[PDB]
Write a protein that binds this ligand. Structure first.
Ligand code: ZL8
Length: 121
């Protein structure tokens, strides 16, 4: 399967599944600064799933590795902001991360294989 472009629709599909997951609800839009006025004293680069989907749809990802970096930032921000490893929002982030990683692995492998095939000669 050597289609260099196939990752984009595969990532759209996976974002749709993430938006159906109840565990994504805290991460679908930017963290609420009124509720969390100290957020930007901890978190240098906010990220959320609506921003990832918009970046993808705008044609502003060149590879699925770039999308994966932004999704992993959603999860590292949650871990950095949590007051406890037992907190609800952080606990939802860990389940959603496991789901994401289980599904993105084939997207990344297929893309990287397609690029190697493109450069074979
Ligand atoms: O629930 C908490 C945690 C304390 N409260 C907090 O510091 N936060 C709660 C609000 C969410 N939050 C965000 O800013 C955030 C981060 C990512 C995404 C989004 Cl959407 C929002 C983090 C800040 N516990 C105290 C009471 C008890 S008693 C037994 C266990 C506990 C644990």
């Amino acid at each position: 399967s050597y289609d260099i472009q196939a990752w984009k629709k595969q990532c759209e599909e996976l974002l749709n599944l993430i938006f159906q997951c109840e565990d994504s609800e805290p991460f679908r839009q930017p963290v609420d600064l009124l509720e969390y006025p100290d957020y930007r004293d901890i978190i240098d680069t906010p990220m959320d799933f609506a921003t990832v989907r918009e970046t993808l749809e705008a044609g502003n990802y060149e590879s699925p590795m770039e999308l994966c970096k932004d999704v992993r930032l959603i999860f590292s921000n949650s871990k950095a902001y949590t007051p406890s490893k037992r907190s609800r929002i952080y606990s939802m982030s860990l389940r959603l991360s496991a789901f994401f990683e289980e599904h993105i692995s084939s997207v990344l492998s297929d893309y990287k294989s397609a690029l190697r095939f493109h450069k074979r000669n």
